[PDB]
Every structure is written in structure tokens, then in C-alpha cells.
Amino acid sequence: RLKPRSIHELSVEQQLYYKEITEACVGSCEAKRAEALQSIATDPGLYQ
Amino acid sequence: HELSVEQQLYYKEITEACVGSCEAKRAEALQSIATDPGLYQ
Amino acid sequence: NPADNYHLARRRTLQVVVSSLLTEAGFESAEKASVETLTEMLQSYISEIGRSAKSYCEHTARTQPTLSDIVVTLVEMGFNVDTLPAYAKRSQRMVITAPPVTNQPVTPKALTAGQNRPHPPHIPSHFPEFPDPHTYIKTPTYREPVSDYQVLREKAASQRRDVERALTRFMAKTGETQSLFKDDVSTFPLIAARPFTIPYLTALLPSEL
Amino acid sequence: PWYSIFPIDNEDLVYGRWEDNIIWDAQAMPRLLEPPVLTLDPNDENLIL
Numbered sequence: 001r002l003k004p005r006s007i008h009e010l011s012v013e014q015q016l017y018y019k020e021i022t023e024a025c026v027g028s029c030e031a032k033r034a035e036a037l038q039s040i041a042t043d044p045g046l047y048q
Numbered sequence: 049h050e051l052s053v054e055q056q057l058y059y060k061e062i063t064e065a066c067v068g069s070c071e072a073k074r075a076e077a078l079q080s081i082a083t084d085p086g087l088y089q
Numbered sequence: 090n091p092a093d094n095y096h097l098a099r100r101r102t103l104q105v106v107v108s109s110l111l112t113e114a115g116f117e118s119a120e121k122a123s124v125e126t127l128t129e130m131l132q133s134y135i136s137e138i139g140r141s142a143k144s145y146c147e148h149t150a151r152t153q154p155t156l157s158d159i160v161v162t163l164v165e166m167g168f169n170v171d172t173l174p175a176y177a178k179r180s181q182r183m184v185i186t187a188p189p190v191t192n193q194p195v196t197p198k199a200l201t202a203g204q205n206r207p208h209p210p211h212i213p214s215h216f217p218e219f220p221d222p223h224t225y226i227k228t229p230t231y232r233e234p235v236s237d238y239q240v241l242r243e244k245a246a247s248q249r250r251d252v253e254r255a256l257t258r259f260m261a262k263t264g265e266t267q268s269l270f271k272d273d274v275s276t277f278p279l280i281a282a283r284p285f286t287i288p289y290l291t292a293l294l295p296s297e298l
Numbered sequence: 299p300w301y302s303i304f305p306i307d308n309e310d311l312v313y314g315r316w317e318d319n320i321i322w323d324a325q326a327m328p329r330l331l332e333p334p335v336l337t338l339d340p341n342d343e344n345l346i347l
Contacts, residue, residue, distance in 0.1 A: 003339045006309045007229030008302045013222030015302050038199050045223050049338050049347050054252050086251035088344050232306040
């Protein structure tokens, strides 16, 4: 008996989004930061 | 999946060393459990 | 609250107008109920030339009222219109400022720019675009599988070597031991050789069959 | 990414109510427990199969 291969609770848009927002929030470019900061400030689905 | 005879024997000796026949074998079994590298599986 | 400010921006402008008209050759420090009375008669007066001069022009098949529609509207309210050029040229005449605008910034939003997805052919292009993936897109995801024969051979080999080393060190430490060097028990311990009664049995006999 | 830049966690620990296997009173076991079969989860690496 092998338990089923589980899936991460984030979608692959959510990991890509998370990866883009975190790589923008380390501030290589300032306009990228500022949008990523506004995206953090008003994304409704940023829970989970 | 299927314990091999080596680790089946190791499991048997380590579990029966911690049932209470003597204290010294118990201390060496607990010092085996605490300080071995490959006890996964 | 911008909901009641739709009405209170223009009714509290009419309160400054009555407060400016009761000061011109007149009062200071009026009663409170006497100001909300007079600014209610002022709003009801502008709303009555609105409804009646529109009615007098639309009776004459027109849509916007001229001067001849208001000088008949004010006659039907008993105004004596001729005294109005003398009232407009006062030296006490004052101007009350118009109310402020809620959207002072006008355009203060950086916004959030996200585009994904197109339109099915029953939705034309002028409807808003479909939103991003996080809004409604879910795919399961799994852990990275290591199907490599080299690292699987290495893992099985090292685990077998480590478990047999652990087993032989445990059995040499908890029994009689021999050593090639002097008092050498920590490094290279040998399980001591124990003779049997029937050595051929332990020997020839297969153990896995 | 192709898979995930996110680590896979034990679904049983993260989600299951393991609290229901705690034995608060031996005599008053509110539910009847059953023998557990070995399930050999393959999500864990370091296991050949």
C-alpha cells in the first residue's frame, strides 16, 4: 500500500506569482519593487 | 518496503535490548539509536 | 461619508447664503431653527422656479427656458420682477463660495497590472479582460522524483554498507572481541571466533532458500 | 516553475487530526482504535521504493 502522491497547496500560478513577487521585492529595479509592494498591499487572494 | 535480514536483525536486537533483561545492553542500544547515521527505513 | 455629502454640500452652501443674506443690513447670531427654516424656503424656491419655468416652456413645445418663461414664472409666484435690477447692484452684495470636490487627487492610483487568459467567441473584445491565474486557476503539483540509476545505486550501496557496519560494530562491542593491534576495540573490532559442536551444519547449510 | 519552488509537507501532519490517536483515559477510550497497516509513503525520499 503506498499513500497517494500529494500536491502542494499552492497552484503553479501561485508559486510563479510568489517567485516573481519575491524576486521583485529584493529591489533590483524600483518600479518592479513598487508594483510588487502594491500587489502585496491589495491582493485579496494573498492568504494561503 | 520489505526490511532486509540485516536491518530485521538490527530491529530485533535493538527492541529486545530495551525490554529490561539488563541495563548495560539497554544503554548501548540507546546509544546506538541516538548515534547511528542510517536508521531511516 | 460621501453619500450624505451629495446633499449636504449644496444644502450647507445654502446655509452660508442665508447667513450672508441675514447679515446684509441686518442680524448677527440668529436662532438655529430660524436658519434651517429660511434655507428650507430657499431650496423650495429654487426648486419651484425649476419645476414651473420648465412647465411653461414645455407647454410652448420647447425644452430649454428663455427669459420670457421665467418672467411669467416669477409673476405667477408674485415677485414684482422690476425691483430685481436694483437689488443686483447693491454695495452690500456678497458672493458665497461653491463647495469643495471629494476627489482632490483625481488620479492617485498606481494600480495593479496583471494580464492572463483571452476571450471565448461569445464574449466580444470590448468586455473586460479575464483576470489573472491566482483568481481561479488550480493545478496539483508533486515532489521532485529522483529516478536516476546512478544515485539509486549509490543510495542502496551506502545504506547497505552503513547498516552492516553498524551491525558488526554493535555485535563486536557487546560480546567477546579480538583485535589486530593492542587494546584496539574502538577502531576495527573483530567478533571473536566461537567454535561449534557440528561446524558442517552452520557451514554447508544454505540460509536463504 | 515546472513543479514547485515550494516544499511538499506531510499531509497527515498538516491536515489529519492525529490528536484523535491520543489516549486520554485507558478505560474510557471514547472511540475503538484498530491495528494500523504499514503504508510505506513514497513521497519521502531516502526510501528506494
